[PDB]
Amino acid sequence: MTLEDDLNATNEYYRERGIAVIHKKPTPVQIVRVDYPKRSAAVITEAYFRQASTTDYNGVYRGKYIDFEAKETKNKTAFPLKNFHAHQIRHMEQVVAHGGICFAILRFSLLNETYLLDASHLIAWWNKQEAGGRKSIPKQEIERHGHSIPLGYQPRLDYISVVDNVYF
Amino acid sequence: MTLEDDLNATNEYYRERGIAVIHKKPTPVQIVRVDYPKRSAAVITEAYFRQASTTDYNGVYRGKYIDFEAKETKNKTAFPLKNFHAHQIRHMEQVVAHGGICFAILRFSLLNETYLLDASHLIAWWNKQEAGGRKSIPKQEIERHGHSIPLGYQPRLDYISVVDNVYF
Amino acid sequence: MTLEDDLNATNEYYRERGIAVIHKKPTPVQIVRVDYPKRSAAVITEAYFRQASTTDYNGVYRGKYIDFEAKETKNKTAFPLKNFHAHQIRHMEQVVAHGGICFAILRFSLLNETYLLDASHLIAWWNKQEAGGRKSIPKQEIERHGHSIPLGYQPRLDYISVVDNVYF
Amino acid sequence: MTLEDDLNATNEYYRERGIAVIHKKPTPVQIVRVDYPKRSAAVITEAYFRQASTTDYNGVYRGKYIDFEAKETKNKTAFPLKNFHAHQIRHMEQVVAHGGICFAILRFSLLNETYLLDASHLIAWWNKQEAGGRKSIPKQEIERHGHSIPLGYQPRLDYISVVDNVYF
Ligand code: NI
Ligand code: NI
């Protein structure tokens, strides 16, 4: 069970219970060729994968825009920043600036530890890497600036309960 | 150009100017077949459109979740309700219940007339088809209950100005 | 007592005290047969119930149109959606689009608990049934997005104090 | 082509076109005995006509409570106040006090002249009758204090267009 799997089930749990309306953004593709047979499915015959200009999850919760990225590592001491891309980091900056609720869910998959971290800490650590600093955020930095997410069932990853305390 | 083109330019404009962070969602695609060519990039050679479970645009403006659907018609007297799909309408109802700002941008492309119609109106009309009901929204409904969007350049379609007037 | 009786006493209290002018709509009745006796008043001897085209309560409070459906259940965990009829959910959708204040009063009669739930939530839940959404609103949703109504006397069910806090 | 007939067709047209949500209150009847046969309609076996405590039509237009009574007279020079009842007048007083839009639709059937008359005037004349005054309002007073509703095609009696001018 990957983080993505745990998030798909969590987001569905939340939607089914009326707790929050959060979807994973569909994989982005540029469709070039398609044909349209009379009474059967349109078929894409030529399309390319594009780069996402935005993070992977968004939706609404108590009238607010929620926006996040979710990543997991096998590393035991630090979260590597290679998982993140510049476009995503710049998108997040724009969301925070406009009053969105924006964060990363970070899983240390060998320690069974999941954290919510506000985008501002992530943006900062990314800009330090840009300026030539570390290429991974120390785990104790995440524990201190982020929020442990208890992992159970219904939901598997109860991040909205963290969002409730941190942002409202 | 198309409403989708004009909205792309408009969303770009708002992002660049620090006005609003709004993006089109990618059409969901079921990939069936990918090929790996001579020098160039990977090509999806067969793929299908999945039914979308949300509306096409979302993001954040002045701290609020903003969500909307954009449709155009060549009809001159009414907006056909078959332009909107069951799953899009359900998403809209859910967004409204969760305190989000949700509306439709409707274009009579033959008339050069674009309106913003709050979701509540689209929900009522669409849901009313059931008991016979109209299969379209008369243009008069859209003029009396909706809001004309001034077309131009920078932005192409200034919906945010109308949103300021309606929802704030 | 029944919710209907408590709402009758409550509305009469609101009218006598100059707070709100709210009335129950009489049950629509197809009259088939009528007897005329000696001294006695005319009697309806055969009649049928019609499908209701609206919700059962409406009126005016502080310049606003107020419209509501009141239902009760003996269920302990969820409110059954079958208690609401298509024509009433339609009506609510239209009232909301027309700028009215529209909600549901939900009583769990075995628990002695009464909640106000805005129409937007009932519309999202009820319309979600269609694809295979559940057939009841979990009480958790009603607790999360609805508003407990104080019960006592003068009035029996003080829903106008909740209306004031939610809509004004 | 009776006033009730014309109002029925008009009210339905308004609903169909998304103009207003206005219905006639159903006939009040006290339901005493009913049978609930096994898989068949419920049958009211004993019931009585009760006195209506409110006026006949109400609903929502543009966020406002609309409430009216519709009466016609064969008299050619005055409208008899006998068509009105104290309890309706008291209800109209309470609607006005609480910010409702309340009026009467008065038709001279032999003249084909229909007037919207604000509840204020009806209340004033009624209370004069009560102090031992005229039991009928001269048609020239209804002309000067009322607002003419011409007969049309769609709808028959376009009272909402008079409502929009008088109250908005
Ligand atoms: Ni409308
Ligand atoms: Ni809800």
PDB file of N, CA, C and O and ligand atoms in Angstrom, chain A residues 17-19, chain B residues 94 97-98, chain C residues 117-118 120-122 124-125 137 141-142 144-146, ligand 2:
ATOM      1  N   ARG A  17     -18.587  10.658   2.975  1.00  0.00           N
ATOM      2  CA  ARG A  17     -19.097  11.110   4.259  1.00  0.00           C
ATOM      3  C   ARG A  17     -19.472  12.620   4.285  1.00  0.00           C
ATOM      4  O   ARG A  17     -19.942  13.126   5.297  1.00  0.00           O
ATOM      5  N   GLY A  18     -19.258  13.327   3.175  1.00  0.00           N
ATOM      6  CA  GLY A  18     -19.491  14.763   3.102  1.00  0.00           C
ATOM      7  C   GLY A  18     -18.531  15.598   3.949  1.00  0.00           C
ATOM      8  O   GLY A  18     -18.886  16.665   4.410  1.00  0.00           O
ATOM      9  N   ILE A  19     -17.321  15.102   4.171  1.00  0.00           N
ATOM     10  CA  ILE A  19     -16.366  15.788   5.020  1.00  0.00           C
ATOM     11  C   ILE A  19     -15.583  16.865   4.251  1.00  0.00           C
ATOM     12  O   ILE A  19     -15.364  17.966   4.763  1.00  0.00           O
TER      13      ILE A  19
ATOM     14  N   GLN B  94     -22.232  19.613  -4.533  1.00  0.00           N
ATOM     15  CA  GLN B  94     -21.310  19.317  -3.417  1.00  0.00           C
ATOM     16  C   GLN B  94     -20.432  20.516  -3.087  1.00  0.00           C
ATOM     17  O   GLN B  94     -20.155  20.774  -1.916  1.00  0.00           O
ATOM     18  N   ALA B  97     -22.601  22.996  -1.339  1.00  0.00           N
ATOM     19  CA  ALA B  97     -22.835  22.551   0.063  1.00  0.00           C
ATOM     20  C   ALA B  97     -21.607  22.779   0.991  1.00  0.00           C
ATOM     21  O   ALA B  97     -21.771  23.027   2.195  1.00  0.00           O
ATOM     22  N   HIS B  98     -20.395  22.780   0.405  1.00  0.00           N
ATOM     23  CA  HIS B  98     -19.137  22.971   1.153  1.00  0.00           C
ATOM     24  C   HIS B  98     -18.618  24.396   1.173  1.00  0.00           C
ATOM     25  O   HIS B  98     -17.514  24.665   1.652  1.00  0.00           O
TER      26      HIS B  98
ATOM     27  N   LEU C 117     -30.905  21.847   8.842  1.00  0.00           N
ATOM     28  CA  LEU C 117     -29.914  21.579   7.776  1.00  0.00           C
ATOM     29  C   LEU C 117     -30.274  22.408   6.549  1.00  0.00           C
ATOM     30  O   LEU C 117     -31.357  22.256   5.988  1.00  0.00           O
ATOM     31  N   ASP C 118     -29.381  23.308   6.152  1.00  0.00           N
ATOM     32  CA  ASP C 118     -29.573  24.065   4.929  1.00  0.00           C
ATOM     33  C   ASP C 118     -29.884  23.164   3.721  1.00  0.00           C
ATOM     34  O   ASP C 118     -29.381  22.050   3.608  1.00  0.00           O
ATOM     35  N   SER C 120     -28.968  23.114   0.764  1.00  0.00           N
ATOM     36  CA  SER C 120     -27.823  22.768  -0.077  1.00  0.00           C
ATOM     37  C   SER C 120     -27.249  21.403   0.211  1.00  0.00           C
ATOM     38  O   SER C 120     -26.902  20.679  -0.718  1.00  0.00           O
ATOM     39  N   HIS C 121     -27.183  21.045   1.506  1.00  0.00           N
ATOM     40  CA  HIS C 121     -26.777  19.732   1.958  1.00  0.00           C
ATOM     41  C   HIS C 121     -27.800  18.653   1.599  1.00  0.00           C
ATOM     42  O   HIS C 121     -27.420  17.577   1.170  1.00  0.00           O
ATOM     43  N   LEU C 122     -29.094  18.943   1.755  1.00  0.00           N
ATOM     44  CA  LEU C 122     -30.115  17.935   1.498  1.00  0.00           C
ATOM     45  C   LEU C 122     -30.146  17.655   0.000  1.00  0.00           C
ATOM     46  O   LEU C 122     -30.240  16.495  -0.405  1.00  0.00           O
ATOM     47  N   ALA C 124     -27.593  18.011  -2.165  1.00  0.00           N
ATOM     48  CA  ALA C 124     -26.398  17.217  -2.564  1.00  0.00           C
ATOM     49  C   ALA C 124     -26.547  15.722  -2.191  1.00  0.00           C
ATOM     50  O   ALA C 124     -26.340  14.827  -3.036  1.00  0.00           O
ATOM     51  N   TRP C 125     -26.923  15.451  -0.939  1.00  0.00           N
ATOM     52  CA  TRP C 125     -27.194  14.068  -0.523  1.00  0.00           C
ATOM     53  C   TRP C 125     -28.310  13.339  -1.305  1.00  0.00           C
ATOM     54  O   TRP C 125     -28.171  12.186  -1.739  1.00  0.00           O
ATOM     55  N   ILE C 137     -28.740  10.088   5.141  1.00  0.00           N
ATOM     56  CA  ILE C 137     -27.711  10.998   5.583  1.00  0.00           C
ATOM     57  C   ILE C 137     -27.177  10.542   6.930  1.00  0.00           C
ATOM     58  O   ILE C 137     -27.916  10.517   7.888  1.00  0.00           O
ATOM     59  N   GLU C 141     -22.841  13.777   9.414  1.00  0.00           N
ATOM     60  CA  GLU C 141     -23.007  14.838   8.436  1.00  0.00           C
ATOM     61  C   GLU C 141     -23.956  15.938   8.944  1.00  0.00           C
ATOM     62  O   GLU C 141     -23.651  17.136   8.852  1.00  0.00           O
ATOM     63  N   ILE C 142     -25.087  15.509   9.496  1.00  0.00           N
ATOM     64  CA  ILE C 142     -26.078  16.413  10.099  1.00  0.00           C
ATOM     65  C   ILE C 142     -25.475  17.161  11.284  1.00  0.00           C
ATOM     66  O   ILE C 142     -25.659  18.356  11.420  1.00  0.00           O
ATOM     67  N   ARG C 144     -22.128  17.639  11.689  1.00  0.00           N
ATOM     68  CA  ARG C 144     -21.059  18.475  11.111  1.00  0.00           C
ATOM     69  C   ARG C 144     -21.569  19.744  10.378  1.00  0.00           C
ATOM     70  O   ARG C 144     -21.040  20.838  10.549  1.00  0.00           O
ATOM     71  N   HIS C 145     -22.578  19.589   9.534  1.00  0.00           N
ATOM     72  CA  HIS C 145     -23.000  20.706   8.698  1.00  0.00           C
ATOM     73  C   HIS C 145     -24.350  21.291   9.120  1.00  0.00           C
ATOM     74  O   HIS C 145     -24.742  22.317   8.610  1.00  0.00           O
ATOM     75  N   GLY C 146     -25.069  20.621  10.021  1.00  0.00           N
ATOM     76  CA  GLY C 146     -26.341  21.144  10.511  1.00  0.00           C
ATOM     77  C   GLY C 146     -26.168  21.797  11.881  1.00  0.00           C
ATOM     78  O   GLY C 146     -25.077  21.970  12.367  1.00  0.00           O
TER      79      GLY C 146
HETATM   80 NI    NI E   2     -23.272  18.782   4.078  1.00  0.00          NI
END
